[PDB]
Amino acid sequence: NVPHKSSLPEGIRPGTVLRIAGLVPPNASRFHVNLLCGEEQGSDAALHFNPRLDTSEVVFNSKEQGSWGREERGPGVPFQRGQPFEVLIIASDDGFKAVVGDAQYHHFRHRLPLARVRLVEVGGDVQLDSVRIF
Ligand X SMILES: OC[C@H]1O[C@@H](O[C@H]2[C@H](O)[C@@H](O)[C@@H](O)O[C@@H]2CO)[C@H](O)[C@@H](O)[C@H]1O
Let me know the angle formed at the C-alpha of 99 by 24 and 36, rounded to the nearest 5 degrees.
80
**Residues 25-44 as x/- pattern, contact with ligand X by CB under 6 A:** --------------------
Helix, strand, coil fractions of the chain, as percent rounded to 5? 0, 55, 45
The number of beta carbons lying within 10 Å of the beta carbon of residue 130 is: 10
Q: Is 70 marked within a binding site? A: yes
Please give the distance of CA 125 from its chain centroid, rounded to a whole number: 14
**Residues 51-90 as x/- pattern, contact with ligand X by CB under 6 A:** --------x-x------x--x-------------------
Of residues 112-131, those binding its own copies (CB under 8 A): 130
| Least distance in angstroms from the C-beta of 71 to ligand X | 5
Q: Does the footprint of its own copies cover residue 84 (CB under 8 A)?
A: no
Residues contributing to the site for ligand X (CB under 6 A): 48, 50, 59, 61, 68, 71
